[PDB]
Design a binder for these strands. Sequence first.
DNA 1: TTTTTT
Length: 429
Amino acid sequence: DMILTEEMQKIMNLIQDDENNVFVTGKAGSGKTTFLKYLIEKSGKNCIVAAPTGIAAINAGGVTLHSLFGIPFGPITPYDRLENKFSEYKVELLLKMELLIIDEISMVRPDILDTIDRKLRWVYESDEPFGGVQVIMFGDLFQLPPVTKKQEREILSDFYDGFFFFNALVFKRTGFHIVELTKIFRQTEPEFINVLNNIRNYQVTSDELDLLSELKDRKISSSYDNEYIHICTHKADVEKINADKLGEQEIRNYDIVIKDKFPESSIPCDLHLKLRVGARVMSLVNDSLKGYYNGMLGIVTALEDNVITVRMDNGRTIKFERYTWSNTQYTLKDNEIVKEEIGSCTQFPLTLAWAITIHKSQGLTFDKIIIHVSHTFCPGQLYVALSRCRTLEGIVSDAFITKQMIIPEYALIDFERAYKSEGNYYGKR
DNA sequence: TTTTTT
Ligand SMILES: Nc1ncnc2c1ncn2[C@@H]1O[C@H](COP(=O)(O)OP(=O)(O)O)[C@@H](O)[C@H]1O
Ligand SMILES: [Mg+2]
């Protein structure tokens, strides 16, 4: 099935030595998130796959970085204390892992990598960066950046010159090679690739955007015989469209249950979970026993009182039960600080998958999509949504595509000049 | 106003 480009073998040779870290970039559809599936199948018996988002982790066969390394939400400064301790089952994992793969690195905060470094340096008991573990990063800096809430930026701008993964402070202590894939796969249309890559480079003309006028077509909603999908910029449109696609003339509501104090905004799951038979669903957590990792997709076969039966896209059937989330914070017992749980919520780890966010959709491939991008945005978000689909016809838009939707980021322009000046390499040598 | 733990 797969084709090995001259650059891919060239990339394969660079990582044959242990001491070289490599960042593999390329345009959307260049075959990077694919090529890493091909790399896993040779070197030693070691590798770990991970990504920032649960879905891109599924797309690469890995897990989330926060679940793998036990990273709490929010930035960790070098002065911040390490909150979570690895178990003995997890320590053997990281110790036996001789190679680390991070898919879709563009969405990774720089403090996360330094949290990876500090946790790897301690679990390996070594002063070498990342515990001396080889790291290979896949992603396109021109897709979209991480989050990057405003409260967390001013906090990180104390210790960090930039908010992008390469700004991490471990790159004072080490560095990485950069190789780009110049061949596109996902789209076979030459005129559609041209306008795509021009959306990516911020250099594009309104005569090329004329090609996207056909995306205003309302043509076919039908049918579920190979279906259709919605990708929205904001979670509110995803929330409405999923409920819009479920008429609720039929069936179930599943209510959450809260013990003690669990603030609304901090609740990870649905307060009232509404589902019918044949409803698109997404697994919200990781269970190795049942076998559903977070980010997987499925469809509801049956709805009972305490059990939901779902047939996943991978072909495996899972019976979902109620998952319990624990809310723990910092309080005072005795005289001392304590981690005690101040509340818990319980619901099924499922949510309606008909719609979705460009953020969650990054890395995915589709034959037919329905793009919702209105005039509301965040940088690089449009290039992602367009490039998900293989064909220009399969794309359906809510509104006309305008240059207003393009938000350039000039730090990526400077970063490209930097490493291309030295041997396609960034950081310390 | 977008994601993400043991
Ligand atoms: N070397 C390759 N050979 C054949 N098809 C490929 C190759 N690389 C990618 N593809 C195809 O391109 C599409 C998306 O691939 P993917 O690697 O996930 O995109 P990206 O490089 O932007 O992360 C898939 O349909 C895949 O089959
Ligand atoms: Mg990808």
